[PDB]
Amino acid sequence: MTEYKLVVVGAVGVGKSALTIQLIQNHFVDEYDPTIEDSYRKQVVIDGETCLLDILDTAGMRDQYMRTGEGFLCVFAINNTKSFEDIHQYREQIKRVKDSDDVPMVLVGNKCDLAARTVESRQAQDLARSYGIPYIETSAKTRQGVEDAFYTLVREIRQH
Numbered sequence: 216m217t218e219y220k221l222v223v224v225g226a227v228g229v230g231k232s233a234l235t236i237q238l239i240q241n242h243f244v245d246e247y248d249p250t251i252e253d254s255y256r257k258q259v260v261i262d263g264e265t266c267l268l269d270i271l272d273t274a275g276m277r278d279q280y281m282r283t284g285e286g287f288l289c290v291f292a293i294n295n296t297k298s299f300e301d302i303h304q305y306r307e308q309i310k311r312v313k314d315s316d317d318v319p320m321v322l323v324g325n326k327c328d329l330a331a332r333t334v335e336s337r338q339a340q341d342l343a344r345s346y347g348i349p350y351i352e353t354s355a356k357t358r359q360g361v362e363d364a365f366y367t368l369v370r371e372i373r374q375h
């Protein structure tokens with residue numbers, strides 16, 4: 216069937232792994248185990264299309280793995296201002312590995328269940344707008360926005 220290769224990138228501890236594991240395995244990872252490079256594959260129906268999702272969960276080396284990616288979830292945490300500022304460097308890395316200024320991407324503000332917010336929605340909306348991509352908030356803990364974020368990325372890949 217149709218295969219979509221997604222890559223999740225972003226600063227250490229923003230919740231890349233928890234998001235991917237919530238989507239794929241339907242539980243929340245409470246502990247912190249730094250990732251080297253993990254991949255997940257799951258058959259899912261997205262907008263009536265049966266497809267194979269391959270998701271590369273990267274470390275916050277990353278270059279070669281990222282090269283095959285068709286779309287990128289650029290994740291920061293809403294209680295981590297520095298992770299948000301880092302998004303610029305992640306986007307540049309993506310532009311380099313894909314050798315393109317037109318790569319499917321979705322900006323993700325994770326940990327939206329937490330209250331120590333230092334990145335306001337409008338600030339992230341603005342960044343996403345500058346890149347010409349959607350901004351979506353998520354919580355790997357409550358599941359809020361998780362399916363939306365990943366499926367939106369699939370929908371962005373289909374637009375390119």
Ligand SMILES: Nc1nc2c(ncn2[C@@H]2O[C@H](COP(=O)(O)OP(=O)(O)NP(=O)(O)O)[C@@H](O)[C@H]2O)c(=O)[nH]1
Pocket residue numbers: 225226227228229230231232233234244245246247248249250251273274275325326327328329353354355356357
């Ligand atoms: N409350 C809350 N905690 C979260 C959320 N997502 C991740 N966390 C917590 O934040 C920590 C780091 O998450 P993790 O998924 O390991 O982050 P990472 O971005 O994959 N880290 P790395 O870059 O090292 O691989 C964990 O303790 C996890 O439970 C979220 O949406 N809400």
Ligand SMILES: [Ca+2]
Pocket residue numbers: 242243244245
């Ligand atoms: Ca758990």
Ligand SMILES: [Mg+2]
Pocket residue numbers: 231232233248249250272273274275
């Ligand atoms: Mg991880």
Ligand SMILES: [Mg+2]
Pocket residue numbers: 310311312313314
């Ligand atoms: Mg290059």
Ligand SMILES: [Mg+2]
Pocket residue numbers: 333
């Ligand atoms: Mg502020």
